[PDB]
Write a protein that binds this ligand. Structure first.
Ligand SMILES: CCCCCCCC/C=C\CCCCCCCC(=O)OC[C@H](COP(=O)(O)OCC[N+](C)(C)C)OC(=O)CCCCCCC/C=C\CCCCCCCC
Ligand SMILES: CCCCCCCC/C=C\CCCCCCCC(=O)OC[C@H](COP(=O)(O)OCC[N+](C)(C)C)OC(=O)CCCCCCC/C=C\CCCCCCCC
Ligand SMILES: CCCCCCCCCCCCCCCCCC(=O)OC[C@H](COP(=O)(O)OC[C@H](N)C(=O)O)OC(=O)CCCCCCCCCCCCCCCCC
Ligand SMILES: COCC(CCO[C@H]1CC[C@@]2(C)C(=CC[C@H]3[C@@H]4C[C@@H]5O[C@]6(CC[C@@H](C)CO6)[C@@H](C)[C@@H]5[C@@]4(C)CC[C@@H]32)C1)COC
Ligand SMILES: CC(C)CCC[C@@H](C)[C@H]1CC[C@H]2[C@@H]3CC=C4C[C@@H](OC(=O)CCC(=O)O)CC[C@]4(C)[C@H]3CC[C@]12C
Ligand SMILES: CCCCCCCCCCCCCCCCCCOC[C@@H](O)COP(=O)(O)OCC[N+](C)(C)C
Ligand SMILES: CCCCCCCCCCCCCCCCCCOC[C@@H](O)COP(=O)(O)OCC[N+](C)(C)C
Ligand SMILES: *[C@@H]1O[C@H](CO)[C@@H](O)[C@H](O)[C@H]1NC(C)=O
Ligand SMILES: *[C@@H]1O[C@H](CO)[C@@H](O)[C@H](O)[C@H]1NC(C)=O
Lengths: 119, 1420, 173
């Protein structure tokens, strides 16, 4: 599955960071079966923390590390699964992953963004 | 000018520009023998060694002023140029541009470009190229850039008239190179389609391959004749599509909905929350295995929903929703299906199931007009178009030849040990006739010995075949090596057939010695081609060899582009839709595995392009439209249809006419040997006569008036027309009595007894009729007449059935079976209707030819079937699970023994074989018939390409490249045999024509007397211009209604009426329905307005023009339809009647034809064809009827597997004729055959108690099923070929004759006054020498200008005694010059002679002694 | 396939008879657990009383001595999808005359759906002392015979006529 994300995303401290993610799946998005997981790992060999998940609706896990700054910013039926991180902080630097399953499409999609926080 | 060769110099240029200045100061065609691209004329001879490939002064004097110059190739090729400095930089004298031309004109360069193109094609074929292909495409872009730079640097870019860009193909090269540059240096995006654009590289082939430009030009010019016949096909598809839209609008949406919706659900709350085809099934009725609901219908003759299921109209059209009639668009699509007959069986069995069986009439009309008529019009015009070219070219060709001869002639006028002993021995030992007969009988025996293969071959038989092929290889090898040493090895390899034999014996020794286990088709099929050495003697198989040799010969370049096309489309399909499939497979095949026909690989892409070529495009089109959208897929598939089918049709007609040119390719003298076989024939005849004489010698050494009265009586009573009519009445009634014998006959328990007693009465009447004919004609005259024999046979069968019934010996096996032979009773009618009689005796006169061209076909298919049996022989034995029917996965149950173990441990698993497999040459013939008719070929192919071994579970596509076998088979068989066949048929249907004196074959006497007047109607043109009537206002009214303005406005009004009739669609808003009704109201009132205007003006004369009669008919029908449909809508209810009445409005749409001369002439050819088509339709209806009776008789209680539904089931003379009409177009006969072929009771159940009836046993008889279906297919094919010939003859006829009529009376009166000035005595006799001034004294059109004697001798005027001539013969001879050779000539000749003999009985003074030409021949 | 036939309506006393009742399913391919009840009203009485019930290839015959024995199932065998409920009545006595209601009770078994149809067929049965040949038979026979006779008469008439004609002709010359 083709997943389009910026490999590196550079955002100023305090600004809003939209993490763009779209995916080219031919099959129509069935909200009763579509699956999306967004996770966060500090490094390629570090632990992933799921922070948002779609399962027939939007699920925001409200991880303490993000406070209430995470928002969904996509539209699954339009093949957009982007998220928004409001008022970015230096600790938000790291790796963010968009996982995508669009049954009955066989292949799972994976986008990986390296978010860097500028002064 | 043999010495016209001067290097292009600056001095010459100076003279050129000087002459240009002289021309410009004072203000012919280019000679078609000095153009570029052709070959250099011979008058120049060979080129000096230095001058070749160098700027040469332009040789055509046409360009002698322009700044142009030629350079000639070392192969004497011509190349124009422009002497203007290229790009205002490179003079023709700059050594750079010099060597540029040098490198451009060559043969290394064309081969370079062609090789690069071929490599680039090979690289295109890959779908996922590895990394180094980047550098390879770099190299190709490099070569293209360099060659384009060479060309543009040599011939100038555009800075001159003769230049790069003016070359049209060079535009394609420019596009290719610039797109390569962009695609490499911009990374534009969405490259999935950009990458495709580089396929145009493969088109540069056409520019490079010497002599393809002319072929593509030929095809392009062959299209331009499809102007009218495409207007007409769009128009007919549109009219029939509006009809289909009006009848079936939204019909293919009925779905057997449930009836016990709980949870307070309704149809809508459900139809919203319902997505998965596993959930639709819970609420609708899906057949055991299928992916649609069960189309039902509200009427009684449509399908039927099972109990507890109501038929409602909701959901999604059938077949992925693409095919239906909901919108005009889908109507046009479904009708393109039904016209190209491409899997139309499913549209048939879907509408007939939804709308009702009664609507089969619609299909009858569509398939007979739209499928049959259009394909024939196409096949006509291209043919005619193609034929034209041949004549022209061949004419032009021979013309040039003559010039060459004259060209030549002008030049001629200007000139004015014991090893040799053994060799001789053996060369005598190869006795031409006897050893030739030996080789031939051994060839035929080897073939008939290979055909003895079957699937379960006992090892004894197998080793027998082994040693047999051993001995045959030995014999053939021995004789070939003998012939080799008999003559010089060189002389042996000289003759082609010996190369053939040597190649084949080589292959045989190869696989005998090496025992190649990996390949079987390597040898076991190639030893077969020896059967072609029968071409030596067989003068028909030799025609198949000549057709093929043409296909790879003279008419071979054309075939090339076909390959190119079938390649290009192929790779196009692989680049657009390639990734699309694998990405979207889950939609088109629920298993998430690519469908059998994807385009994800080049091979499969070529498969699908071949499939759409052979006329099966629709299923692949649904899949492709599901995945890659309806936008690209329709463009691609319609482009493939049109282009590919056009090229295949031009190829086919090319081979056809080039083989029929047997009259034009007959230039051979007496054969060096008539037939080496015939030598042995004569010699054995000599020997047999010798031994006959000797044995006869040795045998002789060892040893009442009343009776003739009665016969005249009976002759009268049997010729008397009342008797013939009565007999035909009885025949028709007997056929009806047969037709009522359904399966429901036991329910109608009164019709049964009436029909029984009526069968008794009918057999009695026919016995009495037989006796009457006997007493009348006499056994001698009677048994001579064949028709009388068919009557005798059939009435004797009836008599023996009757006596067996009355004796009580019924139910004694055969006798009961004999009752089914009763079904031949309708055939007794074949002799009473002269239409059927004349068609049947035509086809019987044409049988002999198809005997030869079916024997060659049978040998050919036998070759293919043994090739088959060798490859596929019990490798079809899959281990299916019967519950769903899914071949088990080859991972488990690999070898059959495991399939049987699984049977033992489980259920519903059957080591199942196909039913039309290749197990022995018998079933081989059947499956080849299927593959050659594309009906079932798909199942045979799939189960074959999965073959693994003699008994092993077939893997999914373990032997893929055996598809090739089918395609190669298809081609030859279905595209050469047929071709060959068609050849003789036209020749045959030409010879028979010439046999009768140009008469038309398929018409009676009366039909011909009609036909002649129907031809009279065509091109009448005596039409009087109606006079302008006497009234002020009527004045302006007529002035209006006569101008082209008013008529063209009416036409555009009709076109708008069409476009407002097609803009309706299923489910449209109420508002749109009302406004369309009001627009139609306005169109109705406006057309009535123009009719009333024509009436007001033309007065009575309106009803003169036939087209005006049609206008009045349509306007009345239309206002009726309006009012009556209104009354239906308000008073009555039934919608079906309402729509079938409202359908009448399309008359106005039909009214368009008036304007187009082109559309009219076509369908006028149709209406003059309709007689012959009526006779053929009658005969085809007899055959369809006779087969329908057999259907109802023995195929009624067969199982219901596939193509035999609850409907379409041989259970009634209604359903039986449905199915027979289905398979009349050869469609779907595979399916109808499939359930009959069950015999043994794991497939059937021969003790199935049919409820109500009493005929146990529910599986038909295979040996009669295959006979039934193959015979009906072949008869349908012959009758359809007759139809094709009829329509093509009519089309060839209408075009050739164009005619007008001149007539004048005052010309006679001026002829009389000029007669008095030369004949004062009114003796009606004038001197021939004085006629030289007489004929030059008349006024036009009778005036003939001096010299008159040049033409007067050619008129053939008789002369009475005394060098004198009558008045009438001169007046008529002059009359024939102006009026021509019309039918009125000989009629006017009679009336003027009869009026003269009544006034001048003195015949003694009329007797002519000679004519004008014979006397001059006596003078000279 | 299946064909709805109407039973015969008269039985010859002291002999055997077969009461047809064929209730073909609308769509052949589907399957069901058919089981039937036959009830009957003796001509002269007014009540429909059950005589037999046939479910799962066994004929539980009711205790009416009007049918003690004398009847056996002639309907579909060993299928449990009956589709032919005809019974056979050996020994037709005079008490077997009246009306017969053939109740079917189909349970069409579907994808996720069990419809339970009840079709009812009714039959009129007369016990006759002697088989009256059906009116259609004798009418058809008489029609065939008179038609044969009139056809031969017309033919021989036209024959004698044309013969007298051509005879006068041949004797004229
Ligand atoms: C050399 C050159 C040879 C010719 C090449 C060009 C020939 C044809 C080009 C046709 C281009 C068609 C473009 C269609 C655009 C389109 O996408 O339009 C949409 C419409 C309506 O779709 P919908 O909105 O109902 O979709 C709902 C989907 N559902 C209903 C299946 C569930 O699709 C439709 O009407 C289907 C329209 C089909 C029209 C017939 C195509 C012409 C056939 C034969 C012509 C003679 C050859
Ligand atoms: C679903 C559609 C439902 C609506 C259909 C509405 C229309 C259907 C039927 C109306 C038929 C009305 C009669 C048509 C023939 C009228 C007629 O009078 O036709 C005469 C012609 C011969 O007369 P003429 O033209 O030589 O007249 C001499 C005058 N001059 C030469 C100057 C032209 O005969 C011919 O060709 C006859 C050719 C007849 C072809 C009829 C085909 C109808 C389709
Ligand atoms: O042939 C030569 C002749 C032909 O005789 P024709 O048909 O009567 O001639 C009719 C013609 N119009 C005429 O006036 O001249 O007739 C001939 O002579 C040729 C030989 C005919 C031989 C057979 C005659 C059979 C006559 C019927 C025999 C008895 C059949 C009995 C059938 C069963 C009982 C009804
Ligand atoms: C050189 O001069 C020849 C001339 C006589 C010409 O006679 C022509 C009569 C029409 C005829 C038979 C001819 C050529 C193409 C033929 C067509 C080719 C197509 O093939 C078919 C059948 C096979 C299909 C595969 C394709 O379609 C037909 C529908 C089409 C066809 C058979 C219709 C009939 C055409 C020959 C005499 O001159 C003195
Ligand atoms: C002249 C005869 C003998 C051969 C004709 C072959 C053509 C029909 C083939 C060759 C090139 C192919 C074309 C190559 C490129 C395109 C563009 C393609 O559209 C796109 O790629 C859009 C891409 C985008 O929008 O990003 C549609 C198919 C099409 C027309 C193909 C249609 C089929 C074509 C014209
Ligand atoms: C020229 C040769 C022409 C041969 C024509 C032969 C006779 C052609 C006669 O055709 C009409 C019969 O087919 C009608 O009989 P059916 O039984 O199909 O229709 C009645 C259906 N019910 C009444 C049972 C419902
Ligand atoms: C109409 C005139 C016919 C002219 C041409 C003669 O063809 C007559 C066919 O209708 C004969 O029918 P068949 O018996 O061949 O049809 C069924 C095939 N079997 C399996 C029963 C033998
Ligand atoms: C019907 O019943 C009779 C009497 O038992 C029996 O002999 C016959 O075999 C049965 N026939 C059928 C068709 O079942
Ligand atoms: C009917 O006949 C039976 C004998 O078969 C007899 O026992 C019974 O009484 C009769 N019933 C009537 C109402 O006559």
């Amino acid at each position: 599955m083709e997943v389009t994300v910026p490999a590196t995303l550079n955002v100023l401290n305090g600004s809003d960071a939209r993490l763009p993610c779209t995916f080219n799946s031919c099959y129509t998005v069935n909200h009763k079966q579509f699956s999306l997981n967004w996770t966060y790992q500090e490094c390629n060999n570090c632990s992933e923390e799921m922070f948002l998940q779609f399962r027939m609706k939007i699920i925001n896990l409200k991880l303490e590390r993000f406070q209430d700054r995470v928002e969904f910013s996509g539209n699954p039926s339009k093949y957009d699964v982007s998220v928004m991180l409001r008022n970015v902080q230096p600790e938000d630097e790291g790796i963010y992953n968009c996982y995508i399953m669009n049954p009955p499409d066989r292949h799972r999609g994976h986008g990986k963004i390296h978010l860097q926080v500028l002064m | 000018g043999p010495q016209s060769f001067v290097h292009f110099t600056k001095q010459s240029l100076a003279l050129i520009e000087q002459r240009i200045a002289e021309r410009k100061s004072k203000e012919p065609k280019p000679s078609s023998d000095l153009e570029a691209g052709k070959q250099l004329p011979f008058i120049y001879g060979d080129i000096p060694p230095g001058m070749v490939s160098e700027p040469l002064e332009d040789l055509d004097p046409y360009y002698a002023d322009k700044k142009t110059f030629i350079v000639l190739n070392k192969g004497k090729t011509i190349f124009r140029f422009n002497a203007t400095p290229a790009l205002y930089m490179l003079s023709p004298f700059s050594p750079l541009r010099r060597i540029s031309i040098k490198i451009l004109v060559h043969s290394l360069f064309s081969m370079l470009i062609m090789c690069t193109i071929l490599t680039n094609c090979i690289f295109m074929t890959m779908n996922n190229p590895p990394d180094w292909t980047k550098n390879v495409e770099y190299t190709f872009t490099g070569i293209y850039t360099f060659e384009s730079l060479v060309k543009i640097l040599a011939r100038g870019f555009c800075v001159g008239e003769f230049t790069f860009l003016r070359d049209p193909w060079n535009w394609l090269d420019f596009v290719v190179i610039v797109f390569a540059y962009l695609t490499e240096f911009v990374n534009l995006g969405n490259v999935s389609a950009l990458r495709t654009f580089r396929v145009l590289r493969a088109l540069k082939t056409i520019s490079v391959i010497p002599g393809l430009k002319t072929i593509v030009g030929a095809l392009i010019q062959s299209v331009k004749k499809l102007s009218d016949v495409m207007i007409l096909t769009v128009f007919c598809l549109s009219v029939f599509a509006l009809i289909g839209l009006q009848l079936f609008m939204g019909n293919l949406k009925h779905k057997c909905f449930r009836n016990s919706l709980e949870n307070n659900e309704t149809l809508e709350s459900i139809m919203n929350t319902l997505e998965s085809e596993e959930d639709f099934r819970k609420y609708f009725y899906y057949l055991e295995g299928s992916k649609d609901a069960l189309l039902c219908g509200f009427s009684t003759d449509s399908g039927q929903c099972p109990e507890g299921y109501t038929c409602v109209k909701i959901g999604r059209n059938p077949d992925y929703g693409y095919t239906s009639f909901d919108t005009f668009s889908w109507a046009f699509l479904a009708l393109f299906r039904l016209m190209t007959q491409d899997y139309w069986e499913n549209l048939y069995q879907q509408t007939l199931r939804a709308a009702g069986k009664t609507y089969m009439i619609f299909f009858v009309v569509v398939i007979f007009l739209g499928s049959f008529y259009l394909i024939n019009l196409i096949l006509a015009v291209v043919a005619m178009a193609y034929k034209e070219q041949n004549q022209a070219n061949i004419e032009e060709a021979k013309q040039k030849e003559l010039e060459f001869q004259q060209m030549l002639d002008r030049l001629k006028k200007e000139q004015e040990p014991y090893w040799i002993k053994f060799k001789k021995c053996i060369y005598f030992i190869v006795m031409d006739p006897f050893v030739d007969l030996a080789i031939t009988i051994c060839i035929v025996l080897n073939t008939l010995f290979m055909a003895m293969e079957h699937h379960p071959m006992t090892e004894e038989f197998k080793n027998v075949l082994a040693i047999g092929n051993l001995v045959f290889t030995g014999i053939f090898a021995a004789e070939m090596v003998l012939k080799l040493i008999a003559m010089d090895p060189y002389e042996y390899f000289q003759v082609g057939w010996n190369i053939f034999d040597s190649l084949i014996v080589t292959l045989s020794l190869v696989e005998l010695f090496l025992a190649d286990v990996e390949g079987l088709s390597v040898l076991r099929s190639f030893r077969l081609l020896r059967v072609f050495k029968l071409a030596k003697s067989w003068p028909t198989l030799n025609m198949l060899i000549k057709i093929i040799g043409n296909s790879v010969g003279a008419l071979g370049n054309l075939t090339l582009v076909l390959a190119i096309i079938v390649f290009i489309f192929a790779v196009v399909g692989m680049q657009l839709f390639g990734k699309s499939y694998k990405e979207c497979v889950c939609k088109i095949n629920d298993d998430c595995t690519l469908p059998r026909w994807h385009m994800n690989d080049f091979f499969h892409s070529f498969l699908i392009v071949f499939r759409v070529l052979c006329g099966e495009w629709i299923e692949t089109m649904w899949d492709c439209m599901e995945v890659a959208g309806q936008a690209m897929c329709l463009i691609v598939y319609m482009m493939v249809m049109v282009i590919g089918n056009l090229v295949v049709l031009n190829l086919f007609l090319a081979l056809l006419l080039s083989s029929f040119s047997s009259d034009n390719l007959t230039a051979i003298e007496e054969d060096p040997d008539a037939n080496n076989l015939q030598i042995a024939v004569t010699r054995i005849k000599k020997g047999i006569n010798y031994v006959k004489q000797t044995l006869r010698e040795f045998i002789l050494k060892a040893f009442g008036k009343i009776w003739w009265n009665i016969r005249k009586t009976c002759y009268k009573i049997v010729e008397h027309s009342w008797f013939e009519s009565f007999i035909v009445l009885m025949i028709l009634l007997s056929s009806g009595a047969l037709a009522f014998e359904d399966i429901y006959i036991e329910r109608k328990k009164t019709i049964k007894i009436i029909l029984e007693y009526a069968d008794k009465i009918f057999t009695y009447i026919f016995i009495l009729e037989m006796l009457l004919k006997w007493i009348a004609y006499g056994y001698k005259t009677y048994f001579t007449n064949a028709w009388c024999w068919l009557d005798f046979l059939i009435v004797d069968v009836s008599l023996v059935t009757l006596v067996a019934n009355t004796l009580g010996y019924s139910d004694l096996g055969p006798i009961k079976s004999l009752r089914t032979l009763r079904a031949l009773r309708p055939l007794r009618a074949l002799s009473r209707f002269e239409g059927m009689r004349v068609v049947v005796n035509a086809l019987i006169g044409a049988i002999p030819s198809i005997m030869n061209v079916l024997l060659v076909c049978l040998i050919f298919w036998l070759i293919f079937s043994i090739m088959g049996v060798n490859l596929f022989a019990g490798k079809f034995y899959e281990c299916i699970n019967t519950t769903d029917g899914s071949r088990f996965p080859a991972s488990q149950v690999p070898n059959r023994s495991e399939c049987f173990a699984l049977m033992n441990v489980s259920q519903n698993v059957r080591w199942k074989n196909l039913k039309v497999n290749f197990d022995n040459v018998g079933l081989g013939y059947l499956s080849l018939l299927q593959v050659a008719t594309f009906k079932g070929w798909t199942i045979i192919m799939y189960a074959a390409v999965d073959s693994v071994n003699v008994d092993k579970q077939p893997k999914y596509e373990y032997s893929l490249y055996m598809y090739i076998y089918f395609v190669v088979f298809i081609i030859f068989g279905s595209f050469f045999t047929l071709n060959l066949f068609i050849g003789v048929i036209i020749d045959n249907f030409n010879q028979q024509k010439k046999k009768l004196g140009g008469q038309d074959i398929f018409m009676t006497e009366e039909q011909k007397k009609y036909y002649n007047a129907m031809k009279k109607l065509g091109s009448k043109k005596p039409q009087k211009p109606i006079p302008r009537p006497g009234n002020k206002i009527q004045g302006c009214i007529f002035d209006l209604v006569t101008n082209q303005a008013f008529d063209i406005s009416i036409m555009v009004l009709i076109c708008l009426n069409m476009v407002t009739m097609m803009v309706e669609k299923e489910g449209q808003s109420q508002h749109m329905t009302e406004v369309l009704y009001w627009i139609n109201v306005v169109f109705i009132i406006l057309f009535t307005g123009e009719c009333v205007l024509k009436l007001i003006s033309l007065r009575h004369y309106y009803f003169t023009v036939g087209w005006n009669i049609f206008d009045f008919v349509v306007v009345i029908i239309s206002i009726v339809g309006m009012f009556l449909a209104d009354l239906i809508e308000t008073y009555f209810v039934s919608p079906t009647l309402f729509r079938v009445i409202r359908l009448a409005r399309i008359g106005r749409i039909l009214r368009l034809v008036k304007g187009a001369k082109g559309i009219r002439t076509l369908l006028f050819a149709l209406m003059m064809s309709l007689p012959a088509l009526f006779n053929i339709g009658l005969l085809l209806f007899l055959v369809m009827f006779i087969y329908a009776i057999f259907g109802m008789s023995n195929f009624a209680y067969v199982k219901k597997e596939d193509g035999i539904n609850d409907m379409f089931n041989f259970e009634t003379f209604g359903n039986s004729m449905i199915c027979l009409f289905q398979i009349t177009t050869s469609a779907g006969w595979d399916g109808l055959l499939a359930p009959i072929l069950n015999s043994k009771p794991p497939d059937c159940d021969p003790k199935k108690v049919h409820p109500g009836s009493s005929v146990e046993g529910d599986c038909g008889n295979p040996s009669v099923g295959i006979f039934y279906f193959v015979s009906y297919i072949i008869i349908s094919f012959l009758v359809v070929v007759n139809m094709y010939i009829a329509v093509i003859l009519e089309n060839f006829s209408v075009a050739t004759e164009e005619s007008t009529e001149p007539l004048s009376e005052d010309d006679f009166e001026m002829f009389y006054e000029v007669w008095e000035k030369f004949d004062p005595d009114a003796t009606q006799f004038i001197e021939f020498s004085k006629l030289s001034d007489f004929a030059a004294a008349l006024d036009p059109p009778l005036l003939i200008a001096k010299p008159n004697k040049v033409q007067l001798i050619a008129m053939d005027l008789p002369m009475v005694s005394g060098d004198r001539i009558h008045c009438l013969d001169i007046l008529f001879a002059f009359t024939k010059r102006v009026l021509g050779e019309s039918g009125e000539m000989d009629s006017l000749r009679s009336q003027m002679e009869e009026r003269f003999m009544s006034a001048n009985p003195s015949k003694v003074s009329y007797e002519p002694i000679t004519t004008t030409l014979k006397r001059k021949q006596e003078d000279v | 396939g299946c064909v709805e036939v109407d039973s015969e309506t008269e039985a010859v006393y002291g002999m055997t008879f077969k009461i047809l009742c064929i209730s073909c399913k609308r769509r052949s391919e589907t399957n069901a657990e058919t089981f039937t009840e036959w009830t009957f009203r003796q001509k002269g009485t007014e009540e429909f009383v059950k005589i037999l019930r046939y479910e799962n290839e066994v004929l539980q015959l009711e205790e009416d001595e009007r049918f003690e024995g004398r009847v056996v199932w002639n309907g579909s065998r060993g299928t449990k999808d009956l589709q032919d409920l005809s019974i056979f009545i050996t020994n037709v006595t005079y008490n077997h005359s009246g009306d017969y209601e053939c109740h079917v009770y189909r349970l069409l078994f579907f994808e996720n759906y069990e419809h339970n149809t009840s079709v009812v067929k009714k039959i009129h049965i007369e016990v006759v002392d002697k088989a009256n040949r059906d009116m259609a038979s004798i009418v058809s026979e008489i029609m065939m015979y008179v038609l044969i006779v009139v056809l031969t008469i017309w033919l021989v008439a036209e024959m004698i006529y044309c013969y007298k004609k051509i005879a006068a002709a041949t004797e004229t010359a």
